[PDB]
Design a protein around this ligand. Sequence first.
Ligand SMILES: *[C@@H]1O[C@H](CO)[C@@H](O[C@@H]2O[C@H](CO)[C@@H](O)[C@H](O)[C@H]2NC(C)=O)[C@H](O)[C@H]1NC(C)=O
Ligand SMILES: *[C@@H]1O[C@H](CO)[C@@H](O[C@@H]2O[C@H](CO)[C@@H](O)[C@H](O)[C@H]2NC(C)=O)[C@H](O)[C@H]1NC(C)=O
Ligand SMILES: *[C@@H]1O[C@H](CO)[C@@H](O)[C@H](O)[C@H]1NC(C)=O
Lengths: 50, 50
Amino acid sequence: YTMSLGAENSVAYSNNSIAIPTNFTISVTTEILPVSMTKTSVDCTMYICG
Amino acid sequence: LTGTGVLTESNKKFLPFQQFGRDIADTTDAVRDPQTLEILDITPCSFGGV
Ligand SMILES: *[C@@H]1O[C@H](CO)[C@@H](O[C@@H]2O[C@H](CO)[C@@H](O)[C@H](O)[C@H]2NC(C)=O)[C@H](O)[C@H]1NC(C)=O
Ligand SMILES: *[C@@H]1O[C@H](CO)[C@@H](O[C@@H]2O[C@H](CO)[C@@H](O)[C@H](O)[C@H]2NC(C)=O)[C@H](O)[C@H]1NC(C)=O
Ligand SMILES: *[C@@H]1O[C@H](CO)[C@@H](O)[C@H](O)[C@H]1NC(C)=O
């Protein structure tokens, strides 16, 4: 299929109306970041020739 | 099949037609002695970085 970016949301804009929140949600989200890799050392002489 | 290693006793039970043993990385880590049909693990010698 042709993908859809998101649901349409026509914001009810006018020159004298505002939307004020009356409540809140405390949301906890995860962010995973790699920091380091495996430290590898190669004996070049032994790898090429044994 | 030649190489250098420490030959220890092995708990790997070979099938009777198999002679050598390989790990994931296709290196010979198990072998069968031709004189006496026993299985030997080939641990690589203790190479290290000084
Ligand atoms: C503020 O008012 C506007 C219009 O008076 C609301 O917008 C409508 O929302 C309904 C619900 O989905 C839609 O079917 C209409 O098409 C919207 N109209 C327009 C002109 O956008 C809006 O939802 C109201 N906001 C709140 C928080 O109640
Ligand atoms: C704001 O939202 C919270 C939840 O997001 C509301 O707390 C709930 O209130 C109802 C009835 O008052 C209870 O049945 C729920 O158990 C409550 N949820 C939690 C997590 O405590 C709160 O009432 C809302 N406040 C306003 C003013 O709308
Ligand atoms: C080969 O020689 C060894 C030496 O004792 C013997 O034990 C073995 O039975 C012989 N035969 C085979 C097939 O290994």
